[PDB]
Design a protein around this ligand. Structure first.
Ligand SMILES: Nc1nc2c(ncn2[C@@H]2O[C@H](COP(=O)(O)OP(=O)(O)OP(=O)(O)O)[C@@H](O)[C@H]2O)c(=O)[nH]1
Ligand SMILES: Nc1nc2c(ncn2[C@@H]2O[C@H](COP(=O)(O)OP(=O)(O)OP(=O)(O)O)[C@@H](O)[C@H]2O)c(=O)[nH]1
Ligand SMILES: [Mg+2]
Ligand SMILES: [Mg+2]
Lengths: 86, 176, 86, 175
């Protein structure tokens, strides 16, 4: 309006009191809908950690076995080298 | 009956440790790489001055979560250490002191040779680490420097010549 | 206030403030804070899929190798038996 | 002279495939298990009639996501098929027709032995699958029924006796 009256202000106030509770509806529908998505993330991160931990455990065992194997071959070889001297 | 030389390869993720070691042992560039998990073992039998020698390369992981509780295994009875950085990545060059410090805290002898390798010298238009910087670094730490390319293996310092030179020094117990 | 007057509009002044502590800003806020949560979730999920796919592929290659070795040994056995029938 | 017998172990997750196969090959119960990914291979050399036999067990995955591209590999040149359910879980037992259909669709010959094994028989108070139900299923599919326990390996049908009986049956190519 070029000059606002009480009618103008009133219907404005009703429209805003509509959009406000609409936005409250759209806010309360994200306030926990993502609080759950939080839990899904926690779960998937946990899964990821389990997988990586089991894989890394296998690699640690395999590296350990290889070091023992190398050592065994070193001792065996030096054993032959000691046998030859006699 | 053949002597085994354990040589570990250490550096940031994506500098190309897998590609270098695979290049030396398989004689090809990898069809594809993914982040190394824990460690990969690659071996190559060579003949140096009449003797057969098995070069056993430990291609380590550069990502923190993929090398967790592995370092004790990397450094047990190691015969030589190869530090690697990406010539197109200054950050990977700046990581070198922490890698050195890890080495220092885990090496059990004072006479294990260490060398320094800048990789991806073929990407000349994107290089971030000038030769003279890396050379000064390597000299002050008593390491030879090599600038190489696992992708193009005859560019600058030949990939083969790197590991072969090292293996020669180990076999002779000679200086660098 | 058992009987409200015009000065009780100073309590609506309080509500136009306690509301805009959340009114509109916090919606656009939580919208982007949790459009970032969706991304960490989908990245963790992607990571899980890469991990399992890579594991499964290694197992497939190992099962293929072992089948081929079994086959080699089987051909040895049959060839030996054929030598025996002579 | 050592000939090999590839024997695959098939069944729902958690029925005890890993514990059974390990019990047979290592001669102990697992300290701890996790869901099998892809497959695990366990071997045991035994002697039958003076001949050396390598019993090669494939401990397959029961979870769909962990067996996804493996089934062709399971069934290639398989010498025998062992189906497994959990005696304390009726649903694991109701799964068998689908496992059997998978087998029937992937086998490359009509003369490969199959057997049926109920596991965890030590859990007497919680058993859900009575013997006669299992027995009829087994008979009508031309399979022997075994009820056994990887955890207590001498209860009912001895775990050793199952795989050794099967290996004897394969070696002599007998019914
Ligand atoms: N242009 C070029 N690219 C290379 C070269 N070497 C490796 N790359 C590439 O760099 C990327 C990283 O390679 P990787 O060998 O897997 O790196 P890495 O050091 O093994 O990484 P992590 O296993 O995670 O520690 C890959 O895309 C390679 O293709 C090279 O010499 N030249
Ligand atoms: N009481 C009892 N528990 C058992 C027995 N055998 C296996 N279990 C338990 O059942 C659970 C599953 O065992 P697994 O061997 O890991 O199961 P699986 O069949 O290999 O399952 P997937 O590998 O996922 O396919 C574990 O908790 C075992 O301890 C048994 O003979 N007696
Ligand atoms: Mg790598
Ligand atoms: Mg299992």
């Amino acid at each position: 309006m070029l000059e606002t009256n009480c009618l103008d202000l009133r219907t404005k106030l009703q429209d805003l009191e509509v959009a406000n509770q609409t936005l409250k509806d759209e806010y309360d529908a994200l306030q926990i809908t993502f609080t759950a998505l939080e839990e899904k993330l926690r779960k998937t991160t946990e899964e990821n950690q389990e997988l990586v931990t089991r894989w890394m455990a296998e690699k640690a065992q395999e590296a350990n076995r290889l070091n023992a194997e190398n050592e065994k071959d070193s001792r065996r070889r030096q054993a032959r080298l000691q046998k030859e001297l006699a | 009956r053949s002597r085994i030389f354990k040589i570990i390869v250490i550096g940031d993720s994506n500098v190309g440790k897998t590609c270098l070691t695979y290049r030396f042992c398989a004689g090809r560039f990898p069809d594809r790489t993914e982040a190394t998990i824990g460690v990969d073992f690659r071996e190559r039998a060579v003949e140096i001055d009449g003797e057969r020698i098995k070069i056993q390369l430990w291609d380590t992981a550069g990502l923190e979560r993929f090398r967790k509780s592995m370092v004790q295994h990397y450094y047990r009875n190691v015969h030589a250490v190869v530090f690697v950085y990406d010539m197109t990545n200054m950050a990977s060059f700046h990581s070198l002191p922490s890698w050195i410090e890890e080495c220092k805290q885990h090496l059990l002898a004072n006479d294990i040779p260490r060398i320094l390798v800048g990789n991806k010298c073929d990407l000349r238009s994107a290089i971030q680490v000038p030769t003279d910087l890396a050379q000064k670094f390597a000299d002050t730490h008593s390491m030879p420097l090599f600038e190489t390319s696992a992708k193009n293996p005859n560019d600058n310092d030949h990939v083969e010549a790197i590991f072969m030179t090292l293996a020669h020094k180990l076999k002779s117990h000679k200086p660098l």
